[PDB]
Amino acid sequence: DFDPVQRYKMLIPQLKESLQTLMKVAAQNLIQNTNIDNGQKSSDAPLQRFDKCLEEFYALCDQLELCLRLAHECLSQSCDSAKHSPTLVPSLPYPQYLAVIKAQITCAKDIHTALLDCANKVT
Amino acid sequence: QPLLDAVLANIRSPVFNHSLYRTFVPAMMAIHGPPIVSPVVCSRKRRFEEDERQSIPNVLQGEVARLDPKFLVNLDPSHCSNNGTVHLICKLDDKDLPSVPPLELSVPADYPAQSPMWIDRQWQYDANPFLQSVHRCMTSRLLQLPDKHSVTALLNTWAQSIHQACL
Amino acid sequence: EVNTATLCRIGQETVQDIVYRTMEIFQLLRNMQLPNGVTYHTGTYQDRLTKLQDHLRQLSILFRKLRLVYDKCNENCGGMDPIPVEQLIPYERREIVEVNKKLKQKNQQLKQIMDQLRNLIWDINAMLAMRN
Amino acid sequence: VTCVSQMPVAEGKSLQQTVELLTKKLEMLGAEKQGTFCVDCETYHGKLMYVMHYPLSCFALFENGPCLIADTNFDVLMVKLKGFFQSAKASKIETRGTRYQYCDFLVKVGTVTMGPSARGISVEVEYGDCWSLLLEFLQSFLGSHAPGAPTVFGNAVYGPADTMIQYMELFNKI
Amino acid sequence: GVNLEAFSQAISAIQALRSSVSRVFDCLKDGMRNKETLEGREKAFIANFQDNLHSVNRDLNELERLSNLVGKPSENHPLHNSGLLSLDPYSQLLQAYKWSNKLQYHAGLASGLLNQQSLKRSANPQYVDDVISRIDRMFPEMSIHLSRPNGTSAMLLVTLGKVLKVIVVMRSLFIDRTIVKGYNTEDGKLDIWSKSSYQVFQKVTDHATTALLHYQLPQMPDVVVRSFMTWLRSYIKLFQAPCQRCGKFLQDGLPPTWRDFRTLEA
């Protein structure tokens, strides 16, 4: 069971080192390409794919972005729950909390319908 | 940290800046697929025809447009068309007492000078004693004006000296 | 019973009231928290709901009257329709003036009466200054 | 309330000359005449014989000294316990000077008590920490002096007598 | 919970890192368009590395790190997912939360920019006052109290940190006639009118009267008294004087514009 902060902390150094490695291999591919094209063939060695490098870099970047976004969403959820409901859970009777949530939803829907009828009357 | 790409770009002396194309664009177009990142047509003529060709440098035009309507500037014999660009023949048509029109010939818009030149003054000022006092006051004021300017400073100082030296 | 200038003034006051009611409905919407927050379960909730309901009904009536007065001002273009004095801004009535003079005289009399009243009020305030 | 006070021991010209120079600098600052609350500094001791006065004087025996009674009550207690105390025989000195209230800030110049002493500059705060205006005035008033730093800024609420005892502790300095 | 802002900043930072990587690799995919004197545009490449140095800005997130590590399994949220599987219509609660937050911020910005009023004029309760006073007394280090010794008007006193207590007589609203007194107070048997000061606290009272005449609103006395209480509480320090030195005059206190500075500066 890994945590968002833990996964972020373990992914950041992997991301940095992957960036370093991909930049090194890109520079190697570039100098090899120039030596074979501009000058004479001197780098008699096979280079790397060079596609997997930045591909996995972008993959880890997307992973980090989405997990940090999930953590932000969780914090926002907690904040909005604490603002729209008191901190009470098994203390508060669960059916009463469900009824209160249903009434809150109905009240919000009523306010929205009132504003919509208002806008329509403005039309 | 990755100075390797820096030293490689330093190495990129030869004129064939097309190997980097085959080196980079395959994967770029593979993982990123905007083949048309700007399909909007771009075809405009940069310079067809744009010139005034019908008046003086418009700098002095925009300057003189700001001055008070009590100053009436006209056109003298044609000797300040483009380079000199200014023949400040002005009349102080207002409620105050009138006087002799100033000359105030400034220089090209670079402004390494000012307007006051006072050619027709030799007989216009020494004849009338009061106008002579006006000229004395105007000279004393202009000499105390650090780097006066084309129209605003000169005409303002001239008007204030003309309507201060009444006494 | 033309009341045309008064009608235009009423229309101006009505659009000003529309703007003020917009400000008011925004100020009353900003303080509409969660229903089951602490104690305002339905009481103040439904109270402000009915309040904004009356607000919107009044605003709709105001828009109706604004449309009506605009149509009346448009149809009022009878005789001297162009009237170019707008861009040309400058740079019996005896009975009305006499009624105005009598009204101002009665107003001056009532002003002296109010002066005596406020003098007595300041005196009473002075007495209270002496109180314990 | 209880503001800082120090004594820059100047030399070169004279003691009275330095006092006159400080007074002239204060007057140039705008020191208004506010009398002369000459605060003495007498010693008999670990009690004391503090006679500094601020329209009331008291001696701080210890724990900064209660000395909450009027000067007459303290003098009566002293004369009653004549010898019953352990503090008659030491040198009884008396410092003097003038007190000027510039603007909501009183400055007093404690002169030489027995003759060998400095001129302590004492200021008085309004409410009291609160060293911003204090330092801004001290730097504009004198030079490399007026360190102060009494038993203040510890929070027992703006104790003046403890500061006065600290100032009188300068007896052994000369 | 400001850590949400920190996480959003981190998201923006990593997205900027990705964008900078894309931009520098795209710039490397092009050469000198038209230099004709020197290919100095390669220096922009180095400048692009500066944007890659902005990756170290994401390292700044390690300072903002450790934002949330607790229990509280999603804060009383799971009702149908972790509860009744048939209860699928849950997300309506989150929808309402977002709707309410959006409405709140919208109306807040609207009221903030609606200061440009357009109403020319208006032409064609002691229990409530005590309740408003008690509600305003709810801020820390702002112990206030009232007694109403004389008259139906309100007699309110405030004591924040020092002996600089202030009295303000009210008429159920728009409390005028302010009197501040530093270190004595309620002489005789009730509030007094000595108004003695040190030529500076009297200036403070003048400032308070100026604010009262300035912060007077046509209606809604709640916002009026709230602004009044905030304006008075802003005096809790009296230790800094920008725009000048700390000794411009007898004392440097005038925060009328939500910031204290040197006095005699209008």
Curated annotation (Swiss-Prot), chain A:
<keyword id="KW-0007">Acetylation</keyword>
<dbReference type="GO" id="GO:0060261">
    <property type="term" value="P:positive regulation of transcription initiation by RNA polymerase II"/>
</dbReference>
<keyword id="KW-0010">Activator</keyword>
<dbReference type="GO" id="GO:0005634">
    <property type="term" value="C:nucleus"/>
</dbReference>
<keyword id="KW-0539">Nucleus</keyword>
<comment type="similarity">
    <text>Belongs to the Mediator complex subunit 29 family.</text>
</comment>
<protein>
    <recommendedName>
        <fullName>Mediator of RNA polymerase II transcription subunit 29</fullName>
    </recommendedName>
</protein>
<keyword id="KW-0805">Transcription regulation</keyword>
<keyword id="KW-0804">Transcription</keyword>
<dbReference type="GO" id="GO:0051123">
    <property type="term" value="P:RNA polymerase II preinitiation complex assembly"/>
</dbReference>
<dbReference type="GO" id="GO:0032968">
    <property type="term" value="P:positive regulation of transcription elongation by RNA polymerase II"/>
</dbReference>
<dbReference type="GO" id="GO:0070847">
    <property type="term" value="C:core mediator complex"/>
</dbReference>
From Swiss-Prot, chain B:
<protein>
    <recommendedName>
        <fullName>Mediator of RNA polymerase II transcription subunit 15</fullName>
    </recommendedName>
</protein>
<comment type="similarity">
    <text>Belongs to the Mediator complex subunit 15 family.</text>
</comment>
<comment type="subunit">
    <text>Component of the Mediator complex, which is composed of MED1, MED4, MED6, MED7, MED8, MED9, MED10, MED11, MED12, MED13, MED13L, MED14, MED15, MED16, MED17, MED18, MED19, MED20, MED21, MED22, MED23, MED24, MED25, MED26, MED27, MED29, MED30, MED31, CCNC, CDK8 and CDC2L6/CDK11. The MED12, MED13, CCNC and CDK8 subunits form a distinct module termed the CDK8 module. Mediator containing the CDK8 module is less active than Mediator lacking this module in supporting transcriptional activation.</text>
</comment>
<comment type="function">
    <text>Component of the Mediator complex, a coactivator involved in the regulated transcription of nearly all RNA polymerase II-dependent genes. Mediator functions as a bridge to convey information from gene-specific regulatory proteins to the basal RNA polymerase II transcription machinery. Mediator is recruited to promoters by direct interactions with regulatory proteins and serves as a scaffold for the assembly of a functional preinitiation complex with RNA polymerase II and the general transcription factors. Required for cholesterol-dependent gene regulation.</text>
</comment>
Swiss-Prot record, chain D:
<dbReference type="GO" id="GO:0051123">
    <property type="term" value="P:RNA polymerase II preinitiation complex assembly"/>
</dbReference>
<dbReference type="GO" id="GO:0035914">
    <property type="term" value="P:skeletal muscle cell differentiation"/>
</dbReference>
<dbReference type="GO" id="GO:0016592">
    <property type="term" value="C:mediator complex"/>
</dbReference>
<dbReference type="GO" id="GO:0060261">
    <property type="term" value="P:positive regulation of transcription initiation by RNA polymerase II"/>
</dbReference>
<dbReference type="GO" id="GO:0005654">
    <property type="term" value="C:nucleoplasm"/>
</dbReference>
<protein>
    <recommendedName>
        <fullName>Mediator of RNA polymerase II transcription subunit 20</fullName>
    </recommendedName>
</protein>
<dbReference type="Pfam" id="PF08612">
    <property type="entry name" value="Med20"/>
</dbReference>
<dbReference type="GO" id="GO:0005634">
    <property type="term" value="C:nucleus"/>
</dbReference>
<comment type="similarity">
    <text>Belongs to the Mediator complex subunit 20 family.</text>
</comment>
<keyword id="KW-0539">Nucleus</keyword>
<comment type="subunit">
    <text>Component of the Mediator complex, which is composed of MED1, MED4, MED6, MED7, MED8, MED9, MED10, MED11, MED12, MED13, MED13L, MED14, MED15, MED16, MED17, MED18, MED19, MED20, MED21, MED22, MED23, MED24, MED25, MED26, MED27, MED29, MED30, MED31, CCNC, CDK8 and CDC2L6/CDK11. The MED12, MED13, CCNC and CDK8 subunits form a distinct module termed the CDK8 module. Mediator containing the CDK8 module is less active than Mediator lacking this module in supporting transcriptional activation.</text>
</comment>
<dbReference type="InterPro" id="IPR013921">
    <property type="entry name" value="Mediator_Med20"/>
</dbReference>
From Swiss-Prot, chain E:
<dbReference type="GO" id="GO:0005634">
    <property type="term" value="C:nucleus"/>
</dbReference>
<comment type="similarity">
    <text>Belongs to the Mediator complex subunit 27 family.</text>
</comment>
<dbReference type="GO" id="GO:0000151">
    <property type="term" value="C:ubiquitin ligase complex"/>
</dbReference>
<keyword id="KW-0805">Transcription regulation</keyword>
<dbReference type="GO" id="GO:0006357">
    <property type="term" value="P:regulation of transcription by RNA polymerase II"/>
</dbReference>
<dbReference type="GO" id="GO:0005654">
    <property type="term" value="C:nucleoplasm"/>
</dbReference>
<dbReference type="GO" id="GO:0005730">
    <property type="term" value="C:nucleolus"/>
</dbReference>
<comment type="subunit">
    <text>Component of the Mediator complex, which is composed of MED1, MED4, MED6, MED7, MED8, MED9, MED10, MED11, MED12, MED13, MED13L, MED14, MED15, MED16, MED17, MED18, MED19, MED20, MED21, MED22, MED23, MED24, MED25, MED26, MED27, MED29, MED30, MED31, CCNC, CDK8 and CDC2L6/CDK11. The MED12, MED13, CCNC and CDK8 subunits form a distinct module termed the CDK8 module. Mediator containing the CDK8 module is less active than Mediator lacking this module in supporting transcriptional activation.</text>
</comment>
<dbReference type="Pfam" id="PF11571">
    <property type="entry name" value="Med27"/>
</dbReference>
<dbReference type="GO" id="GO:0032968">
    <property type="term" value="P:positive regulation of transcription elongation by RNA polymerase II"/>
</dbReference>
<dbReference type="GO" id="GO:0061630">
    <property type="term" value="F:ubiquitin protein ligase activity"/>
</dbReference>
<dbReference type="GO" id="GO:0070847">
    <property type="term" value="C:core mediator complex"/>
</dbReference>
